[PDB]
Symmetry: C2
Subunit: 362 residues, 2 copies
């Protein structure tokens, strides 16, 4: 099994995988307990103990992003979508599919979404009800300044929907300090669970009033929450093994020292990565002042010999799975620095990368 | 870990769980291969090699049922929903939420949906475009006669959407003999995978023409299929470990002798169950002539001492998790006979049941 240097699904600890060796009953109180501990550990992290509720959902994070747009953004609401990358585009496609009146702020891939340009467009038309953005655009690993953007959004009585899939668990987000109606994350990223379940931190009072709003049965967070309030059970088949794994990964996250411990490791991995790759002659697409310690985009070698598909295949053989580029304009590739990986796996990865290239991109 | 005598999530083999000990890359060709083998093994079973395509989906089977109603049933289409149980009700809620013009045939819980009453209502109004039903209502384990109903539906140029979640893998369904536009199943039932992914066998030509129809991004089987045609990849995060488990469970299903081998075991489990429970003084809710070998509903003991929650708890301690009743009118409970369980675990379960009751329901 190669190490996965991707934005998830990623390399998980074996504790994490062990947890899946157990079959649970979805009706069973033990599983009801498991579910509740997961929700409360999650709600603990985001700092939403008083004001929000953690609604878990089957499927990927996109499922839960849609679920949140669907259940919280009303029929008569306009959303500003910030779109500085691929995740941002998905937000646009989701509002459209839900035919939700919406408006787009595309700010190109190499530069952050600014509080400033969010300010002007908001001032224009009080029509807009909601603002939606991605915290970390994994397409390039740009970190958007959410705290600056949240404050600017709140200052205008508009409401924030934050996609924190790639960043939740690793970049500090505190609910009482970053006002939002919805933060969405998933199981298989910075928390280091396996993939297969999403969750939404929704404001208690927004969700309670959202009864009937959702365009979807399966993705109705109000119906989901209400039923789970009542019975402690999921409406529909839960992915039991995924929830257990996430519970166990949450155990490890707490043991290791929480967000700061997870952030320190990733920041360290991010450095070793940039450090070693620079020493190979690689340029990062982003300079350090904007670079999230989640995933690094690197300019492809100019060498007319360079083939990503080749380069990927040789590095796999040496025990490391990298990630393709996602930019239309300049050829690149990506290396994650997250999951159950330390500074020393990073340098072995770069050393492998170097070896792969010497057969024969120069 | 107790044995799960439920309709799933259920007791899985350990081969199945072992498969999850591996992290896969969603972009990785190995995982692309894994995904394709799963789809083709699935498409093989339902007999849809020539006419249908297996679209896999994240989340539970309900997610894929919605996905199929959403992507295949047009804006200008009326659906007849057959509703002889809880699964049937969900179908009604889904068409409503999708605001799909629809109509209901409720036939009570103890008697099958008949080809005859489907015939009349169809003749009434050619408005109806689609018919939807559950093959096995797990609420009672009634088997609906789908072959009789399919033929009656086809005979009227209407189109069938079949929820086969509880029955697929164990009751014979052949595509060239049972005309349908969509059969939906999931990973965590009669196939004995773990839960966490759905799939839809959609008619090749219906799905190809469904471009844009879906009410959902996440649940758009056309967009999902098209993208997977192109890249061999899932649009969004796949639950890699779930797909691997299902692959491995599909391996075992093929080794053991396919549908007939799976059916023989379950029919045998079903007998031992009925056999032993009768010998305790239990009455099944259904007589043998209608009873699917999936799950058995049993009349609760009349004894004013009887408490399901108590009865459940003691049987758990003895290594068996049963299932609550789901009927509004008469008190019952349910015992599954599916998953990785043989005739001899069935009799140990009944013997435990007997023991649990002797402390002190009489």
């Amino acid at each position: 099994a190669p190490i996965l240097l991707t934005p998830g699904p990623l390399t998980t600890s074996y504790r994490t995988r062990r947890a899946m060796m157990v079959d649970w009953g979805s009706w069973d109180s033990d599983f009801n307990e498991l579910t509740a501990s997961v929700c409360q550990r999650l709600l603990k992290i985001v700092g939403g103990e008083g004001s929000h509720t953690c609604v878990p959902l089957q499927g990927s994070g996109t499922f839960a992003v849609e679920a949140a747009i669907g259940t919280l953004v009303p029929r008569d609401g306009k959303v500003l979508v910030l779109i500085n990358g691929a995740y941002g585009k998905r937000l646009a496609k989701i509002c459209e599919v839900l035919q939700r009146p919406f408006s787009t702020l595309e700010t190109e891939e190499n530069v952050p979404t600014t509080a400033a340009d969010v300010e002007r467009l908001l001032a224009a038309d009080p029509a807009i009800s909601h603002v939606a953005l991605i915290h970390c655009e994994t397409s390039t690993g740009i970190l958007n300044p959410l705290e600056a953007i949240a404050k600017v959004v709140e200052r205008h009585g508009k409401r924030l929907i934050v996609d924190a899939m790639s960043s939740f668990g690793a970049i500090g987000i505190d609910a009482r300090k970053v006002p939002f109606d919805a933060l969405i994350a998933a199981s298989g990223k910075c928390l280091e669970g396996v993939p297969g379940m999403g969750f939404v931190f929704a404001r208690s009072a927004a969700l309670e009033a959202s009864a009937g709003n959702c365009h979807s049965l399966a993705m109705d967070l109000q119906d989901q929450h209400a039923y789970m309030r009542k019975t402690g059970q999921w409406r529909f088949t839960p992915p039991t093994h995924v929830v257990a794994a996430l519970h166990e990964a949450l155990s490890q996250y707490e043991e290791e020292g929480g967000l700061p411990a997870r952030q320190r490791r990733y920041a360290s991995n991010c450095e070793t990565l940039l450090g070693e790759m620079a020493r190979l002659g690689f340029r990062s697409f982003l300079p350090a002042e904007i670079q999230a310690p989640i995933i690094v985009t690197f300019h492809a070698p100019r060498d007319p010999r360079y083939r990503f598909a080749d380069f990927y295949q040789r590095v796999r053989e040496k025990g490391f799975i990298l990630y393709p580029g996602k930019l239309t304009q300049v050829e690149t590739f990506r290396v994650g620095c997250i999951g159950h990986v330390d500074a020393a796996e990073m340098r072995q990865a770069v050393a492998a990368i170097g070896e792969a290239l010497r057969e024969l991109e120069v």
